[PDB]
mmCIF file of C-alpha atoms in Angstrom:
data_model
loop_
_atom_site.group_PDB
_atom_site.id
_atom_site.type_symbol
_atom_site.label_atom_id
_atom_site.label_comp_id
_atom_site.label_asym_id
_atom_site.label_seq_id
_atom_site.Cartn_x
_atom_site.Cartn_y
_atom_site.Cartn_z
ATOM 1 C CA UNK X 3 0.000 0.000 0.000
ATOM 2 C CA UNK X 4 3.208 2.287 0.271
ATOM 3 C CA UNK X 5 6.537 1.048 -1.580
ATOM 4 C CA UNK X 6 9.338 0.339 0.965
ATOM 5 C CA UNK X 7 11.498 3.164 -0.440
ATOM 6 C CA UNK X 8 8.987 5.252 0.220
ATOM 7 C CA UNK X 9 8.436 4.092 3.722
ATOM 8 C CA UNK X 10 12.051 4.551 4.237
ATOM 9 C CA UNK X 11 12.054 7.778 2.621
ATOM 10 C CA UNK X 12 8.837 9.028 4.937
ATOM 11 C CA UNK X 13 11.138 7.704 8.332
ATOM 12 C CA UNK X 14 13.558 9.284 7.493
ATOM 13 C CA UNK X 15 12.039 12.373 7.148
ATOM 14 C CA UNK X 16 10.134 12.722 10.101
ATOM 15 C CA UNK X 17 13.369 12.055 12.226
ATOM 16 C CA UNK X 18 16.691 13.018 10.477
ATOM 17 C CA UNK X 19 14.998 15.822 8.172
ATOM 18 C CA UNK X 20 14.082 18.041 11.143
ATOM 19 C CA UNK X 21 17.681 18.110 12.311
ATOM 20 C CA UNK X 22 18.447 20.280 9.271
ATOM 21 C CA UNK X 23 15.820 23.295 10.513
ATOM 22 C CA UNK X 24 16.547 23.197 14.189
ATOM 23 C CA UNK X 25 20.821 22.971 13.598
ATOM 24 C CA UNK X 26 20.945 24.794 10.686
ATOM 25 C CA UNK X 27 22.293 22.338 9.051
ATOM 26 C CA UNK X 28 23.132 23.106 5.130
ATOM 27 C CA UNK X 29 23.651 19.935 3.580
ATOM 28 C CA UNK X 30 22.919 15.559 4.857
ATOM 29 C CA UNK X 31 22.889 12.753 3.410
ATOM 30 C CA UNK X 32 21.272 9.928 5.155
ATOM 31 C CA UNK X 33 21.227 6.173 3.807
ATOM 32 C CA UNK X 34 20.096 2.824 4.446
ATOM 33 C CA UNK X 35 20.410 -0.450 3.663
ATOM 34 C CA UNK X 36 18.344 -3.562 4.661
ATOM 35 C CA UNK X 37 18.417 -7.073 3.191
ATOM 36 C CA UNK X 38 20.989 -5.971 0.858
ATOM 37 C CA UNK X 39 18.621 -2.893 -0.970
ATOM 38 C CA UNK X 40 20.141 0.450 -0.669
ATOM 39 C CA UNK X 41 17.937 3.595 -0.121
ATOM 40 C CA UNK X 42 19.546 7.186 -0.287
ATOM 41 C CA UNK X 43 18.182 10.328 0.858
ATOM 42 C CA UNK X 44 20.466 13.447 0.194
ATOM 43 C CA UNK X 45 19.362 16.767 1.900
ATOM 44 C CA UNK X 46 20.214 20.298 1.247
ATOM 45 C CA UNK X 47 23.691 21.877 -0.108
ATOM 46 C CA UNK X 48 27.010 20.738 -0.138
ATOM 47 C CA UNK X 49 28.658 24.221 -0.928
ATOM 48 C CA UNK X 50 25.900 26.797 0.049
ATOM 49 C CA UNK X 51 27.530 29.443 -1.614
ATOM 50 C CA UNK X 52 27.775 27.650 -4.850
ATOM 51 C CA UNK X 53 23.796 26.062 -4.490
ATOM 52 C CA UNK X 54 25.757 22.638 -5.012
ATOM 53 C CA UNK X 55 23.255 20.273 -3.789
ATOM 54 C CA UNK X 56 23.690 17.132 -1.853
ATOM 55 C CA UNK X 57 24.062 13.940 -3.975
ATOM 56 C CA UNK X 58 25.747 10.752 -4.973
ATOM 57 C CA UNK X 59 29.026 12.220 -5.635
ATOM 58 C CA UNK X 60 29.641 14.830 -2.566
ATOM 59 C CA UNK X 61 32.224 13.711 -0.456
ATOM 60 C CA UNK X 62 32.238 14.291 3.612
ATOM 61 C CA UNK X 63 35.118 13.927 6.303
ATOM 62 C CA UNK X 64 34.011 10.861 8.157
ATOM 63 C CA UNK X 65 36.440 12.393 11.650
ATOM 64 C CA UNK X 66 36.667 9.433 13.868
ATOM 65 C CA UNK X 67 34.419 7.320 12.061
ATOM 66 C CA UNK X 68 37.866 6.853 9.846
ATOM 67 C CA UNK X 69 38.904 5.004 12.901
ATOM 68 C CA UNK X 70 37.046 2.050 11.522
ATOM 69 C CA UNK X 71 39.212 2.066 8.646
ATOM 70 C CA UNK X 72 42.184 1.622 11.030
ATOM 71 C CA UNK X 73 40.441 -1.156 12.636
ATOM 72 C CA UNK X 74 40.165 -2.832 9.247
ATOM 73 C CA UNK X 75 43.252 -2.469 7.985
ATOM 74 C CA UNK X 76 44.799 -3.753 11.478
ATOM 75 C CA UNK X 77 42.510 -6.872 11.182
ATOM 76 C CA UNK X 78 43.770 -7.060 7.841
ATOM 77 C CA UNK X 79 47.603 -7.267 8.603
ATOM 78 C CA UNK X 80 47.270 -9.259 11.655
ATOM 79 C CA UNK X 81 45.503 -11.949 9.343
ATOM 80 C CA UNK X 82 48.294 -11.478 6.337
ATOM 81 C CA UNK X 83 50.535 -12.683 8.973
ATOM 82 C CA UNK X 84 51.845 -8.758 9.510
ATOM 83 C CA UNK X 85 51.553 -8.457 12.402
ATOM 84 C CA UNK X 86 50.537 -9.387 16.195
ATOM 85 C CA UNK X 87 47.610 -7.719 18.549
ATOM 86 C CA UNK X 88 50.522 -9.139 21.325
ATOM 87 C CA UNK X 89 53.265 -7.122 19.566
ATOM 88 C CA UNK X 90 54.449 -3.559 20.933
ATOM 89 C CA UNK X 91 55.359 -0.893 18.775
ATOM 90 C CA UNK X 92 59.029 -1.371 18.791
ATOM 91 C CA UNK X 93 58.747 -4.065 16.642
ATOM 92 C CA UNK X 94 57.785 -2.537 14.200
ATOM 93 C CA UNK X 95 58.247 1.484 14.579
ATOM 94 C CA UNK X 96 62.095 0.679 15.585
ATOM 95 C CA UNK X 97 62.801 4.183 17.500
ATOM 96 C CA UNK X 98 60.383 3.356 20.082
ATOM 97 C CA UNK X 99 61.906 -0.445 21.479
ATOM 98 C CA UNK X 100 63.796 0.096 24.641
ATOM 99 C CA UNK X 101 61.462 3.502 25.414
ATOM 100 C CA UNK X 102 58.087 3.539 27.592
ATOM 101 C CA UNK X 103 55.120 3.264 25.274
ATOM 102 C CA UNK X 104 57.111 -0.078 23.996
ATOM 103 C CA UNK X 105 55.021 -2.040 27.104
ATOM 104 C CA UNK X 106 51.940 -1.352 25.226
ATOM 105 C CA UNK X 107 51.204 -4.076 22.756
ATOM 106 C CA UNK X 108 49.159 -3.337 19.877
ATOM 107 C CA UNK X 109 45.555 -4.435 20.812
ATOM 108 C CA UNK X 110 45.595 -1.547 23.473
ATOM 109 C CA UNK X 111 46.749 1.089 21.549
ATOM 110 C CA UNK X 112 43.708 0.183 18.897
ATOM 111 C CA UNK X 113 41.088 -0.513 22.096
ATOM 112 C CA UNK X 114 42.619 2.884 24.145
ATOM 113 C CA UNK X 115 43.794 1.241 27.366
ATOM 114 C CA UNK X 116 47.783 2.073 26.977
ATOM 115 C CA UNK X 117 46.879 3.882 30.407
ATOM 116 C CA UNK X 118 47.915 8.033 29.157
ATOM 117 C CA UNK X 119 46.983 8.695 25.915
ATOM 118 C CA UNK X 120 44.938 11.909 26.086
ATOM 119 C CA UNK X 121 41.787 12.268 23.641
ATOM 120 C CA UNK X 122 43.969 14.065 20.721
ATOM 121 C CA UNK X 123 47.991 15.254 20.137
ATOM 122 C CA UNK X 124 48.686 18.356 21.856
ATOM 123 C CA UNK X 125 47.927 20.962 18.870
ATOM 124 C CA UNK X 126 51.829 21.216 18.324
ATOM 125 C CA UNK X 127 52.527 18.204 17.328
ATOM 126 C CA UNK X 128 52.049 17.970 13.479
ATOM 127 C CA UNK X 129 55.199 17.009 12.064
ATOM 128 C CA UNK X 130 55.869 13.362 11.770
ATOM 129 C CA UNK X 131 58.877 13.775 13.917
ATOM 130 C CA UNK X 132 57.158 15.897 16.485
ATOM 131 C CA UNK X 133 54.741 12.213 16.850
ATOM 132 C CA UNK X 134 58.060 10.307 16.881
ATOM 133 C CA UNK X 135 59.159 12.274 19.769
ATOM 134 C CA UNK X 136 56.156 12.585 21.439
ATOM 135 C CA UNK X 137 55.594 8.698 21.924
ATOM 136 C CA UNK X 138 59.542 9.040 22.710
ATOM 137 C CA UNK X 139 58.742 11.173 25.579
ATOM 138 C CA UNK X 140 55.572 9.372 26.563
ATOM 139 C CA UNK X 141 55.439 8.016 30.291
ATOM 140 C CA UNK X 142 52.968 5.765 31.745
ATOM 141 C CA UNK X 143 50.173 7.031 34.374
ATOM 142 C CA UNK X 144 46.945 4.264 35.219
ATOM 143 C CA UNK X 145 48.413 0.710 34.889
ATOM 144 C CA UNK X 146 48.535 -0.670 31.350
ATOM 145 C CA UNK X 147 45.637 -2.468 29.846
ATOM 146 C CA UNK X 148 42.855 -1.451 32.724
ATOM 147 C CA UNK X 149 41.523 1.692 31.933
ATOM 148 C CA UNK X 150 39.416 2.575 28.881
ATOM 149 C CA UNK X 151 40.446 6.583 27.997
ATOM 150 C CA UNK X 152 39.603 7.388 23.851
ATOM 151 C CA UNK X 153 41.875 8.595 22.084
ATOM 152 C CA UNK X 154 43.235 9.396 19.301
ATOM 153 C CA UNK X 155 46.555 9.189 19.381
ATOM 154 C CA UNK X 156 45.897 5.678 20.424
ATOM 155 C CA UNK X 157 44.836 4.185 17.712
ATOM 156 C CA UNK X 158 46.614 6.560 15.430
ATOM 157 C CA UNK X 159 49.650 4.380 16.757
ATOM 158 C CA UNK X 160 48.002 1.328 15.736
ATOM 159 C CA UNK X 161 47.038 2.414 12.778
ATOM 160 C CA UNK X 162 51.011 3.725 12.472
ATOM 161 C CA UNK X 163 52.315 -0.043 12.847
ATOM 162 C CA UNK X 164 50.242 -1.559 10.650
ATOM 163 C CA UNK X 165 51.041 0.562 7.691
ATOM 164 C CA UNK X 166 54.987 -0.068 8.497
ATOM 165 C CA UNK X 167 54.513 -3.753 9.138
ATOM 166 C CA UNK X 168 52.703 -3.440 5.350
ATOM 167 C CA UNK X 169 55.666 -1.550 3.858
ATOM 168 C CA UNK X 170 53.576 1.120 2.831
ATOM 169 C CA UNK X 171 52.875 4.792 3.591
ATOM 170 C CA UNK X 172 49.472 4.853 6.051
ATOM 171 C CA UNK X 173 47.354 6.411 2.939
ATOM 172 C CA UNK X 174 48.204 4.110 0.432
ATOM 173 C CA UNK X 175 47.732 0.850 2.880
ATOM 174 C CA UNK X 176 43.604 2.148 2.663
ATOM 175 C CA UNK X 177 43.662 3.772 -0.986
ATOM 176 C CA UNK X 178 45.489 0.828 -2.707
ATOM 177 C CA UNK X 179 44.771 -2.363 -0.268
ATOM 178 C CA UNK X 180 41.660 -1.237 1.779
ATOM 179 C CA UNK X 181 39.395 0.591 -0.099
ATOM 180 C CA UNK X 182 39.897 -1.452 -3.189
ATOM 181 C CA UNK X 183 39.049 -4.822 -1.223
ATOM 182 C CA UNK X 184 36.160 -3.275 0.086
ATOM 183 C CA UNK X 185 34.851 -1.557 -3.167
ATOM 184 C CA UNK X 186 35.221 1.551 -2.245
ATOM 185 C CA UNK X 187 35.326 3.893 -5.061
ATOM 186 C CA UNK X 188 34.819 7.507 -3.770
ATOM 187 C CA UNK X 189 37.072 6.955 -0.199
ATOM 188 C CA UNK X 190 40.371 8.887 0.279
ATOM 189 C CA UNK X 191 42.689 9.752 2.067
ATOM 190 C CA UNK X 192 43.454 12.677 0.136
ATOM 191 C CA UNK X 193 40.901 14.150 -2.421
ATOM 192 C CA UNK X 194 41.996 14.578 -6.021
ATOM 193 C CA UNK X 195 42.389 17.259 -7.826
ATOM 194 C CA UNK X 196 39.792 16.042 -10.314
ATOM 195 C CA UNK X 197 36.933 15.378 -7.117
ATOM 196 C CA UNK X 198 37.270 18.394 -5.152
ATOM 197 C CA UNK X 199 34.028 19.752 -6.785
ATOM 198 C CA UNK X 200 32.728 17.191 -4.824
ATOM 199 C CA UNK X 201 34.465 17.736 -1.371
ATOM 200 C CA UNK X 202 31.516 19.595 0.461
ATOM 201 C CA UNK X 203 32.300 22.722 2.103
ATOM 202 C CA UNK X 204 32.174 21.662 6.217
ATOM 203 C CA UNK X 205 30.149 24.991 7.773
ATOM 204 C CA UNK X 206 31.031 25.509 11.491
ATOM 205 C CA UNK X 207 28.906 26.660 14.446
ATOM 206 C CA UNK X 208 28.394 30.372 12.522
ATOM 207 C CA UNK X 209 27.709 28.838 9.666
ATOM 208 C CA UNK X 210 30.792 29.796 8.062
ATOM 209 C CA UNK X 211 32.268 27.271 5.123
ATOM 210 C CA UNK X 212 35.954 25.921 6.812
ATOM 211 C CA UNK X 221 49.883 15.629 10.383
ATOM 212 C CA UNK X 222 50.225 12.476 9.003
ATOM 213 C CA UNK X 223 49.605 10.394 11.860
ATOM 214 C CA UNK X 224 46.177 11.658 11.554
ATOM 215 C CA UNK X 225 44.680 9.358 9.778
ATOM 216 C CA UNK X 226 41.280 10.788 8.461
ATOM 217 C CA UNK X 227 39.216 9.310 5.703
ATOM 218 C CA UNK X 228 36.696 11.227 2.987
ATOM 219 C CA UNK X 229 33.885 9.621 1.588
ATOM 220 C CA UNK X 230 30.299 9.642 -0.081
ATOM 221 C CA UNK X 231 26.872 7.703 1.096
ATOM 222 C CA UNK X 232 27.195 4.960 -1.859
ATOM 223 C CA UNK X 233 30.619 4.097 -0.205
ATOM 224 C CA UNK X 234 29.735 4.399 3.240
ATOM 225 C CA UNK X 235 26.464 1.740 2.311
ATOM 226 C CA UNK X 236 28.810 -0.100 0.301
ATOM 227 C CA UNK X 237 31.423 0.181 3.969
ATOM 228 C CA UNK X 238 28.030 -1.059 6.123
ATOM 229 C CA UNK X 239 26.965 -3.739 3.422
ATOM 230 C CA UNK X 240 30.858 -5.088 3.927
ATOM 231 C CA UNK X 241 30.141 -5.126 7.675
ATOM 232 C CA UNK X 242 26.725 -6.731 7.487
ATOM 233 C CA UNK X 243 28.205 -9.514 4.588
ATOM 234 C CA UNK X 244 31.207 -10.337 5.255
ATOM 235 C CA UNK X 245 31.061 -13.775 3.528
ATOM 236 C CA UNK X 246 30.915 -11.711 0.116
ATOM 237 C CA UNK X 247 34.373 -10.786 0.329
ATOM 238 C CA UNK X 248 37.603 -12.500 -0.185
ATOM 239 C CA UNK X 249 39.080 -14.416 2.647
ATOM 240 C CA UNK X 250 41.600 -11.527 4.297
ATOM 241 C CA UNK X 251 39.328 -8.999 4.138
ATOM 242 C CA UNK X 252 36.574 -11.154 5.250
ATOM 243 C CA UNK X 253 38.507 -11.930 8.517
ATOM 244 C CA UNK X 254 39.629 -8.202 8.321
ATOM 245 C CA UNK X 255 36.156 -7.068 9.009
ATOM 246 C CA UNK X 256 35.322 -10.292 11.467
ATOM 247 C CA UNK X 257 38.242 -9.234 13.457
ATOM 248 C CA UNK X 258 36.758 -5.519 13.909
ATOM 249 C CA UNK X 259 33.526 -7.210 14.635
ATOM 250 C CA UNK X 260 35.262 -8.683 18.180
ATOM 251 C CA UNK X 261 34.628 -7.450 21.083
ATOM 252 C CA UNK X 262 37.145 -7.151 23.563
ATOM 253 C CA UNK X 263 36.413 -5.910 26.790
ATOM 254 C CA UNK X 264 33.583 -4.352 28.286
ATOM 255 C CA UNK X 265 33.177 -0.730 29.920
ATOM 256 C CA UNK X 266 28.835 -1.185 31.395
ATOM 257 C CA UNK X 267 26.786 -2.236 28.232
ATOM 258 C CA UNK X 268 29.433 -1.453 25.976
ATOM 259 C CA UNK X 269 31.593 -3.621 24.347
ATOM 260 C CA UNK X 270 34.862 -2.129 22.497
ATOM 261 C CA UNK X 271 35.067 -4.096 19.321
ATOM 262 C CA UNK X 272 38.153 -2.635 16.876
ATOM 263 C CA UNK X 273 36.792 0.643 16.152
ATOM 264 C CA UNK X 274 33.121 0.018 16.292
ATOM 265 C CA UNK X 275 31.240 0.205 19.534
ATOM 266 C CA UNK X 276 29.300 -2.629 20.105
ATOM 267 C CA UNK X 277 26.035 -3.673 21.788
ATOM 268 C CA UNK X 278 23.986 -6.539 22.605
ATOM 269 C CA UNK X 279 20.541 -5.940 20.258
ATOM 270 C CA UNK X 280 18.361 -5.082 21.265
ATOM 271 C CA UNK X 281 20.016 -2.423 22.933
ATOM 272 C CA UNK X 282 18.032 0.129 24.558
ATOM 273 C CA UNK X 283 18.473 3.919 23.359
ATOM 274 C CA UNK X 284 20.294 4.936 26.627
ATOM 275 C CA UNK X 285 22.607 2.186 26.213
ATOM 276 C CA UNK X 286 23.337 4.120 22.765
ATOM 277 C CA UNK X 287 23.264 6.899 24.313
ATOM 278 C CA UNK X 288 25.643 6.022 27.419
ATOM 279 C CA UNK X 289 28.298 5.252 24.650
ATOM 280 C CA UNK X 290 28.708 9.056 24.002
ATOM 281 C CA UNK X 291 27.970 10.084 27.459
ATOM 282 C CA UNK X 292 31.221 12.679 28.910
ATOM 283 C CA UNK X 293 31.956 9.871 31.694
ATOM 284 C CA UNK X 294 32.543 7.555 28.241
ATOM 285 C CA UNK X 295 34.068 9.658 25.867
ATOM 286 C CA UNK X 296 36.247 12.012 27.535
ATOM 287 C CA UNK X 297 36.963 10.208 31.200
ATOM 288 C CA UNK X 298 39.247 6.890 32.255
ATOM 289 C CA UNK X 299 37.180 4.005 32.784
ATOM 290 C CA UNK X 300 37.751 1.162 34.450
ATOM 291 C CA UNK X 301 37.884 -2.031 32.004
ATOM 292 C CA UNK X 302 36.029 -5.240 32.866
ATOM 293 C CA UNK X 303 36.003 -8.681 31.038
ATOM 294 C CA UNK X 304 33.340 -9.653 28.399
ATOM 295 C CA UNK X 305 30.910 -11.778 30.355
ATOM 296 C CA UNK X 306 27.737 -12.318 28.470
ATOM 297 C CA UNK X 307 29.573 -12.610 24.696
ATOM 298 C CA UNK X 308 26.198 -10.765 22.640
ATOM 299 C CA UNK X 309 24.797 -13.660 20.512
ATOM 300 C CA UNK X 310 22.528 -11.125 18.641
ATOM 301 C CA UNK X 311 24.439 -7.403 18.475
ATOM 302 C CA UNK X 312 24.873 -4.192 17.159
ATOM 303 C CA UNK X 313 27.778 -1.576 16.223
ATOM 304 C CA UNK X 314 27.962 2.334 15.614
ATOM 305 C CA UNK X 315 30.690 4.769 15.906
ATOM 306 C CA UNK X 316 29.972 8.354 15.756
ATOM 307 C CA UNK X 317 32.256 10.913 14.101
ATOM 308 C CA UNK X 318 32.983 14.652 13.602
ATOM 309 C CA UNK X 319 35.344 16.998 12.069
ATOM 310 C CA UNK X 320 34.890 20.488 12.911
ATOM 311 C CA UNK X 321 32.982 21.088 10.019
ATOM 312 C CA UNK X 322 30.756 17.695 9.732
ATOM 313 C CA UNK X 323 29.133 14.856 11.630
ATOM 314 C CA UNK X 324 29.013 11.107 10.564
ATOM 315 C CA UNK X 325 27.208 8.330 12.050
ATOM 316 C CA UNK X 326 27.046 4.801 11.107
ATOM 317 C CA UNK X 327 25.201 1.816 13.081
ATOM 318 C CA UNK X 328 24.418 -1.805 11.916
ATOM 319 C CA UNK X 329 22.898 -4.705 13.059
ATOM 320 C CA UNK X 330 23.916 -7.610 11.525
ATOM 321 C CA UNK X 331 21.079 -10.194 12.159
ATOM 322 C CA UNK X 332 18.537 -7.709 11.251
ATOM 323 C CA UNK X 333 20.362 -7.492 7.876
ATOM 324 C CA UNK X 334 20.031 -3.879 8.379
ATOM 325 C CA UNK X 335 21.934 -0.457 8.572
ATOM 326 C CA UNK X 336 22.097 3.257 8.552
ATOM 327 C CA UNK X 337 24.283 6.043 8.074
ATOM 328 C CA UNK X 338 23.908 9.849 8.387
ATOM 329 C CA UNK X 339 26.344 12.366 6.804
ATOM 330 C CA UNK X 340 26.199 16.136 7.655
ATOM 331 C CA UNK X 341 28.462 19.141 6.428
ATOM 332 C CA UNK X 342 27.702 20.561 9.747
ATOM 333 C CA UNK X 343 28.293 18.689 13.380
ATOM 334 C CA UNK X 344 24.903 17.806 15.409
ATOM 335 C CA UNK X 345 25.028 16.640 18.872
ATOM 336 C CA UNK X 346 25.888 13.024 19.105
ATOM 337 C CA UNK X 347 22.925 12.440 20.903
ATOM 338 C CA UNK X 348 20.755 13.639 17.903
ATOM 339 C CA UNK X 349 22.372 11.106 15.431
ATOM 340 C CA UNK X 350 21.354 8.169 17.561
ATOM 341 C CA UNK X 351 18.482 8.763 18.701
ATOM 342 C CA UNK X 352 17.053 9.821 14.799
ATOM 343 C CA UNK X 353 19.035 6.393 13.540
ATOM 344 C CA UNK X 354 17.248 4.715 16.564
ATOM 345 C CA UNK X 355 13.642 6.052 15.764
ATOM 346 C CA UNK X 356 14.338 5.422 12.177
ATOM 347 C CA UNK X 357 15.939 1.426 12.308
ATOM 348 C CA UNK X 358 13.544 0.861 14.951
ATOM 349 C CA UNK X 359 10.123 1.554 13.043
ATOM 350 C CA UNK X 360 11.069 0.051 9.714
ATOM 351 C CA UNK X 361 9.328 -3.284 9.041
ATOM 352 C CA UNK X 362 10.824 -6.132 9.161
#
């Protein structure tokens, strides 16, 4: 009596659409997929100045939803054979064996438990030496491997070792080995000359358009569905990226109802929206938390990571035995909150 897409479509209007009015948001794109069908809703402007609306082709900054990437491409070495969650950096980053951050292996940098690792670099540190030194210089404070603290730098470590344990520069392990295996088409590191008619302008909180070791991804919905339907299928792909994404899928520890999978958050489903929510509490996202062992290993589950740049806002959540997932692109940054609760209204009412 009303077409799926157009069911989709009307959901998420009612939820994500309004977000646009009340935080002036210029431009969103908002997809989903379910049972391997893609839907795409694009919103508004990419470049307001230039009335360049939303589409296929604009490209956002996905912030720390790139952090997936990382995940993948660690899950990807570690089944080449490249590396070892056990190893510590000094294995493979040679000027840091003998020094402090060496009794950090490589699953804590990625799952941010190396005990002082702050949520970002100080704002000096941009040259790849000034990172070099600063891991140099870098002291232990809580005790190794118990307390949860995000960061950055953290996994921008990890994500450091695997692309020397692959022989490649960080950007090339995801645009030539990554991207490719996952069919991503529109995803870069660095934009190209030839796409940045594409790149959409990221408007900060006035509405105004706006190192290497940060490792920050750009991409468009079809990618980011194409990304999800990866996630949701792995059994598509060929074997190491298939147990590339598997291993990102594991969670490792547990902080309350979350789990800390590599990169994603994850959830046992069905999680309740202040379980979502609790994920991006302060207490969670800026504060040390005490670690605790997975007890109940979720059966039936569900990931997300949010992201932001100052200039945009990503969200992406899936639920794999639901066959079913969602992802929300903005050229201006929402509150967290907002993302999850609209993706939670929307997955929520869509039949079955």
């Amino acid at each position: 009596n009303t077409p799926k897409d157009q069911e989709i479509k009307k959901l998420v209007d009612q939820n994500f659409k309004p977000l646009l009015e009340k935080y002036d948001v210029p431009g969103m794109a908002v997809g989903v997929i379910q049972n391997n069908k893609k839907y795409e809703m694009y919103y508004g402007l990419q470049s307001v100045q230039d009335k360049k609306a939303v589409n296929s082709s604009t490209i956002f900054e996905l912030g720390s939803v790139s952090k997936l990437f990382t995940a993948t491409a660690g899950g990807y070495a570690k089944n080449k054979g490249k590396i070892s969650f056990d190893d510590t950096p000094g294995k493979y980053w040679k000027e840091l064996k003998n020094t402090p951050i060496d009794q950090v292996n490589l699953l804590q940098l990625a799952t941010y438990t190396s005990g002082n690792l702050a949520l970002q670099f100080p704002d000096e540190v941009k040259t790849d030496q000034q990172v070099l030194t600063f891991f140099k210089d870098w002291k232990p404070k809580n005790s190794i491997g118990e307390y949860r603290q995000y960061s950055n730098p953290s996994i921008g470590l990890f994500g450091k070792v695997v692309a020397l344990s692959m022989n490649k520069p960080f950007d090339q392990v995801l645009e030539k080995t990554i991207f490719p295996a996952l069919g991503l088409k529109h995803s870069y590191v660095n934009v190209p000359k030839t796409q940045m008619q594409n790149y959409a302008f990221g408007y900060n909180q006035e509405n105004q358009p706006i190192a290497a070791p940060a490792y920050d991804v750009k991409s468009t919905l079809p990618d980011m569905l194409s990304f999800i339907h990866a996630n949701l299928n792995p059994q598509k792909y060929p074997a190491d990226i298939q147990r590339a994404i598997n291993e990102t899928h594991q969670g490792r520890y547990q902080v309350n109802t979350m789990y800390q999978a590599l990169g994603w958050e994850e959830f046992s489903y069905p999680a309740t929206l202040q379980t979502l929510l609790d994920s991006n509490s302060e207490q969670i996202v800026m504060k040390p938390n005490k670690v605790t062992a997975i007890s109940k290993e979720p059966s039936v589950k569900m990931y997300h990571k949010t992201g932001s740049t100052n200039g945009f806002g990503t969200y992406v959540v899936f639920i794999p035995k639901e066959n079913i997932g969602l992802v929300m692109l903005t050229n201006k940054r929402i509150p967290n909150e907002e993302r999850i609760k609209a993706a939670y209204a929307v997955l929520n009412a869509i039949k079955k």
